Amino acid sequence: FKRNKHQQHLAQLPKISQSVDDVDFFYAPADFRETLLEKIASAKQRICIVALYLEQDDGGKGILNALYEAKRQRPELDVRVLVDWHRAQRGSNTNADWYCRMAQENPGVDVPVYGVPINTREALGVLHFKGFIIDDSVLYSGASLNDVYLHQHDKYRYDRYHLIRNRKMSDIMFEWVTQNIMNGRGVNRLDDVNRPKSPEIKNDIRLFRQELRDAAYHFQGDADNDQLSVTPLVGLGKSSLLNKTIFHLMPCAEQKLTICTPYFNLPAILVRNIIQLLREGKKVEIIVGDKTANDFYIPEDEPFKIIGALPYLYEINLRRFLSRLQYYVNTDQLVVRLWKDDDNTYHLKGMWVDDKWMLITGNNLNPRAWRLDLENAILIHDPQLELAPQREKELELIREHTTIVKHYRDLQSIADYPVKVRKLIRRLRRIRIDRLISRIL
């Protein structure tokens, strides 16, 4: 009788109904900045800002000042900021130190900044939960809050920006954050000068992480599969509902799958899916950054550092992949795009399934995100093509700064790389550490 197990998974997802008028796309980091400030000013009930980090720079200051200002003008407003515990406490003078100063320089005005530790050490888990919850809306982006993400000062970091007004969804997400994160073990205020040091809360974090391993949104679906819907998703570790949905989503492409990821480093299981689609005669588009649009890339004139080898390693991944699937490139089934715009940086994430599904997420679609980090998403089901104008405009602009790679040879090989890079990579591959690196970054 029934459909294949992949469509079944998606058909039976709980779905919240959504008005087309209540979904607003933004196409540029500057618009995103201004929208965030506007919504902070006009907020009436609550502001919940979850980000990887909020930087002690002009961009980040702008946001924190706007938060203090909104709380001053409406002291009944429920303002919370949640960032990664470990990231906020490292580069000299840290963000956490700055959050402390801010709280002292603004007495009476209550703007709590909580640090979420997803694991005992940064390398083993970070807060990749995304969402600015403002009243009945969620402004959802992969962006953290700093100069480049907000396009202060002339250089930018490209992300995606969607405002979704939806009482039920925002409640579900606000409430989930309240119970599981804010009131979770081992969450600790970063605006407290006496905040513990990581070792002191090590055991709290272990128990916290286990609590998170099966924390999921719980809500009843109110929408069928014939109408515009949104489905919030959250996950930590291999068997999360998010990861399962990402896995099942890809095979439902009857025509074409599109993927954005900053660092091309797909887990094997998602690669196998890609290859199956290509074999079934479908289309697959993959939009990644050029090595030079990576934020770790160091110009060849400057002093080379160890970390500036990452963009090269991601290129090697892309070139190996393309190499194996050049046949499908030639049939115009597989399309790989390299984004590049002077020395601006690329941070696009997401998944398009035909014209019907749009995953917006913080998920970099790499092994790290699949096991270690706390990830979330919104899954937009648009079976009636109501978002078609905006979907198409967004893809138009994403592609605008892209080259299509028509041949794996168009990508530089290790031989073409600078000498220090070349030596480093050969050393790494000798002892097989390249494989480990790709599982932790």
Next chain:
Amino acid sequence: KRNKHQQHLAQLPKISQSVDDVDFFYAPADFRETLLEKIASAKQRICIVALYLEQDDGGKGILNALYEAKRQRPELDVRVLVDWHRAQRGRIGAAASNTNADWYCRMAQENPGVDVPVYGVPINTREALGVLHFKGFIIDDSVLYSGASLNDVYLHQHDKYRYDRYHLIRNRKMSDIMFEWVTQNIMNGRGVNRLDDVNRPKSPEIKNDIRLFRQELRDAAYHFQGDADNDQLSVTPLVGLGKSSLLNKTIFHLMPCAEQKLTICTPYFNLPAILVRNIIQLLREGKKVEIIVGDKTANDFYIPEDEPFKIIGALPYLYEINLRRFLSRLQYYVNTDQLVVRLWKDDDNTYHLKGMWVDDKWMLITGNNLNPRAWRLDLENAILIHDPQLELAPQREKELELIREHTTIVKHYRDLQSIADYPVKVRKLIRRLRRIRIDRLISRIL
């Protein structure tokens, strides 16, 4: 003044039990009929846990009786739980075909409206590393407890049988504890998946779910308050996974409490060293030990010497080698009439007896094969009957009478064939295995 072993048993929580509410059955056919009878007359719930439920006449009989009872009483809570991996393959070496899970799907389609869910329990990511050896048919306020799975031979459909043990125990509290434990830990556990769903996942897709599930199971135990002292008839349900389970500890402590005699049934003689050490201590203390195992020919992997030999048909021989090695070392105790080893054999019927008798006072009924596999890898359970007043004596004795009826006593280890006496292909295979020391590995995984 009590030794640590008796202390362990004295302090076990125990549920009280009426002698009138314990019914033994002595033959696989009676067990079949009793199961069908209880399915018909069930009023509230039927929970069938088995290793497998086979797509054969015997298994069909049972599944049809389940559908029929649910049709006549739609409020009845019917569940079937079998091993995830076992349900999705043929028997070993036989021509891969339609699996049980495929059949469970057909059944559900051919009986719309009638809700008889069949769940697959994966105890580990691969069959060889954990199977569902939990046992129990929970029907209302009773548990019909056997080692038997549901197929032709276990149920003595069609003239050939597989000998197991069969006890019906009516006890509200115990059945509740077992029904509730299954509900929470298994049925609602991670990585349990319906086998009557045509779209059921494949093992690799749920691999991580199964890993987390197994860890949850590693310390899942019955929790209940004992209502009975050590002067009255009691039952104590036990469940375990892995070396330090409460079951395993109870089995370990149980054996030394034999003031007179310990009796053991196991299908495959392959005792872990720790249980062997206990046996030897009993023999040294001057006590008696009876061990009832199958002859090699009563093993279900045994292949008649006329037929084409296959690799798997070496297992009965390996179990015999284990028995012969054991007896060899303890021949002194055989001679003093302390150690008694029995070989069961009845034409080409097969032997699947499990359990432990401690004097006339304790009776462990279990699915536990008492081998290293059961000790570490599989999800095992039991009921421990404490009968300090000898109220079950008629039935206990009748059961042992009939078990022994098809047995030879082995008076000398030499009465067992040596490798030299075995068929040529067998002999060559075994010598090859022992050369590279794989015999030791085999005995820890089967």
Next chain:
Amino acid sequence: RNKHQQHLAQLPKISQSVDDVDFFYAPADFRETLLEKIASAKQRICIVALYLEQDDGGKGILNALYEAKRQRPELDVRVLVDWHRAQRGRITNADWYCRMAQENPGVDVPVYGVPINTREALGVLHFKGFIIDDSVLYSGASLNDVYLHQHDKYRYDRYHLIRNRKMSDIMFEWVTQNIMNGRGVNRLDDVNRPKSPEIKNDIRLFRQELRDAAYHFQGDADNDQLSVTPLVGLGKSSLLNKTIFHLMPCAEQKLTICTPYFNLPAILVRNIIQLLREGKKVEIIVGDKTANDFYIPEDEPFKIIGALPYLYEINLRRFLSRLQYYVNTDQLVVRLWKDDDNTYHLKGMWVDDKWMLITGNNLNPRAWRLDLENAILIHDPQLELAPQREKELELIREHTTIVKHYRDLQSIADYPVKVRKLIRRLRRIRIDRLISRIL
């Protein structure tokens, strides 16, 4: 469920094996069984009776007790009887208990007197039970010639042996704590035993302690299996009395009652009438006046006490009179037991085929307020005792006439002259009503 079934459903119940319940059908068998169990006892013998008489029958039992204690000095032997009854003739035993103790030095068989009230007429020890190891041999019988059918004349009672560790423990332990170690219990084998007035205040405090002494134990058995529930009570609101009250309305088919002296309290009569109205059946088995132990043949010199059998007959006739309609519809059946000059002492209650109350309770106002009473309640929902239940009722009925009409019972006019005059005198001043509340 209605409140009556609910009461019974929620009673704590001890499980019981059908193999461990043995009925006996005749007083002689009961004697022999008692002696057998005394011989073979290994741990304890606790004999509670109204009295143990200084006659051949009673001697037999006391000698068997001394003998068993001689052969096993570690055996815990106790005898408990009524304090007041043991220290008088019929209308003393204690003196005899003293002699026995002196004639058997070294052998420790203590005889305790239990006073349930300061005067006999206001409370007697109607607790019943011979507790022997893990069994209770339960009868209404005291220990004397007729109860034990020594010497050719007998007193009909009921006899059940129930092997059950838990129940016997509960009963043995309850006796230990509440009676044996109770205030105002005193040894009757002591020549220097106090006189009632000296312990009067002890008895008052004792009685108050007894007013809410009840068995405390956890039920181990559901309502789908054979069970036993020990019950004990003193006074109107005891658990026993409540259970007797609730038991009767649970009869879906038929209620059977034995009582030696027909003198039901009004509340139990009202229940009976409700059953009859609901269309159910009620069987009542009592003694003929001549099977009463106070009955004096009409040739012999009449004495005041020999009026009691007549008063019980008047009660029966008044009851039947009011319910003759139900006699006619074959719902109400009244049986008179009579076997030459043997006497009748049957007590109990059958509810359908499912419940059997065995008790010392005469089901009269005295037993309801004044005396220390107990019982065992057998629940047999699976009809496992059906052979024995039916055999017992068969033999009980064997010496019975069915009363088909209240007029078949003699009226006061038909009674001997001295009786007739006495009764008319009593009813003139309304003392008949008082008598029925104290005997």
